From a paper:
Last but not least are erasers, or deubiquitin­ases (DUBs), that remove Ub from ubiquitinated proteins or trim and disassemble polyubiquitin chains, regulating the signal. Here, we explored disulfide-bridge formation as a strategy for producing a stable DUB–Ub complex amenable to crystallization. To this end, the Gly76-to-Cys mutant of Ub (UbG76C) was tested for its ability to form a disulfide bond with the catalytic cysteine of a group of DUBs. Using this approach, two disulfide-linked ubiquitin-bound complexes were crystallized, one involving the Legionella pneumophila effector SdeA DUB and the other involving the Orientia effector OtDUB.
The OtDUB construct, unlike SdeA DUB (which only contains the catalytic cysteine), contains two additional cysteines (Cys111 and Cys116) beside the catalytic cysteine (Cys135), all of which are present in the core catalytic domain of the protein. To further study the effectiveness of disulfide chemistry to characterize DUB binding interfaces, we decided to use the bacterial effector OtDUB, which has recently been crystallized with Ub in a noncovalent complex. The UbG76C–TNB adduct described previously was mixed with OtDUB in near-equimolar proportions and left overnight at room temperature, which yielded approximately 79% conversion, and the mixture was subjected to crystallization without further purification. Even though the protein sample remained as a mixture of at least three different species, crystallization trials successfully produced crystals that diffracted to 1.85 Å resolution. The crystals belonged to the orthorhombic space group P22121, with one complex comprising an OtDUB molecule and an Ub molecule in the asymmetric unit. While the terminal cysteine residue could not be placed due to missing density, the proximity and orientation of the C-terminus indicated that UbG76C could be disulfide-linked to Cys116 of the symmetry-related neighbor. In probing this further, we harvested crystals from the same batch as used for diffraction, carefully washed them and subjected them to SDS–PAGE under either reducing or nonreducing conditions. Under the latter conditions, a single species corresponding to a covalent complex was detected, while the same dissolved crystals produced two distinct bands under reducing conditions (in the presence of DTT) corresponding to separated OtDUB and Ub chains, as expected for a disulfide-linked adduct. Within the complex representing the asymmetric unit, OtDUB makes only a handful of contacts with Ub, leaving most of its canonical interaction patches (the widely used Ile44 and Ile36 patches as well as the C-terminus) unsatisfied. Since we went straight from the reaction to crystallization without purification, our results may not entirely reflect the situation in solution.
Author numbering:
A (entry chain A): 1 to 259
B (entry chain B): 1 to 75
């Protein structure tokens, strides 16, 4: 692991993945919220296509709202949230933790005018970030509050709470790294030498596993059956790891699974 | 660093790699993400097939370089 991966560093710089994992943790139980993972200001086509997809899902009712951590520069993310207002209009709320107006991001604005000129834009324009490394914590906190309909941290509140919101977010990131590592170790023992496995083979490998106890197999399988094992999907190391990481089983036994 | 792998179906895979990663390591990451056996993969960077025991730095692959992935038929 590289030194810039040390969560105990008060100046730890969030990655795109960190932000996504935190939004999924705090917002992802609600299936009707689109958490957008990778979108950048220097990707006009991909940005217009993602915004089109999100607005279409909100218009067509498949989603109620969306959170979009928009990457605008070196370690800089802006918070964009999209939802249905009270007057049959799309409401785009936005805050740059540096306090720069949304008008400075002309590629974003021209992309929104081109896609939805009849959308309302609430640019909250609130300075929060007081240093180069705190954009991550604030884009996360902002997106959570915006999607909850709660006011974002004011400039003064941001100064008092900057260290607290970072602390509780990195506390999750640390626990989540453990869960993902346990899930990946367990996935390895179940996948054996295979490139893919079906859910049906996954079930049989858990049955035949010689490491887990009967009670552990029973909990893991009940967890999987709750949301999976419906259509015999074929899984990769990555999608099996994600599936296992989301089980109560791995969350409750991650340390035992790694040691 | 971030690199991209183009596929024949028009999708682009994004991988997180190190210059010291072997080509085999990169094929293992593609297998982890796409379910493609490494023995079915041939990777190209800028007109050069990538040999399994070399490293990404042997080929001067850079941040945001794009590779091309071609899958074997039959085998």
């Amino acid at each position: 692991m590289a030194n810039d991966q040390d969560l105990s560093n008060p100046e730890y710089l969030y990655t795109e993945d960190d932000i996504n994992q935190l939004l999924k943790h705090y917002l992802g139980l609600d299936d009707r919220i689109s958490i957008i993972q990778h979108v950048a200001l220097n990707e006009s086509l991909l940005l217009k296509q993602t915004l089109h997809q999100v607005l279409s899902d909100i218009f067509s009712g498949m989603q109620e709202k969306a959170v979009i951590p928009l990457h605008t520069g070196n370690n800089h993310w802006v918070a964009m949230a999209i939802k249905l207002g009270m007057n049959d209009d799309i409401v785009i709320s936005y805050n740059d933790p540096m306090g720069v107006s949304i008008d400075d991001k002309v590629t974003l604005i021209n992309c929104i005018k081109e896609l939805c000129p009849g959308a309302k834009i609430n640019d909250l324009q609130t300075v929060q970030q007081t240093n180069v490394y705190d954009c991550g914590p604030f884009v996360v906190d902002n997106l959570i509050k915006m999607s909850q309909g709660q006011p974002i941290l004011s400039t003064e509140e941001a100064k008092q709470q900057a260290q607290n919101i970072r602390q509780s977010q990195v506390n999750f990131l640390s626990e989540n790294r453990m869960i993902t590592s346990a899930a990946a170790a367990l996935a390895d023992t179940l996948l054996k030498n295979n490139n893919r496995i079906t859910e049906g083979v996954l079930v049989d490998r858990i049955f035949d596993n010689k490491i887990l106890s009967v009670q552990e197999k029973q909990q893991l399988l009940n967890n999987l059956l709750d949301n999976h094992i419906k259509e015999n999907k074929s899984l990769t190391k990555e999608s099996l790891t994600r599936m296992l990481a989301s089980t109560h089983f791995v969350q409750q036994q991650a340390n035992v699974l790694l040691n | 660093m971030q690199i991209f792998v183009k596929t024949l179906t028009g999708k682009t895979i994004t991988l997180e790699v190190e210059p010291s990663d072997t080509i085999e390591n990169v094929k293992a990451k593609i297998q982890d993400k796409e379910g493609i056996p490494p023995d079915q993969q041939r990777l190209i960077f800028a007109g050069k097939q990538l040999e399994d025991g070399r490293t990404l730095s042997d080929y001067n692959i850079q941040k945001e370089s794009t590779l091309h992935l071609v899958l074997r038929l039959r085998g």
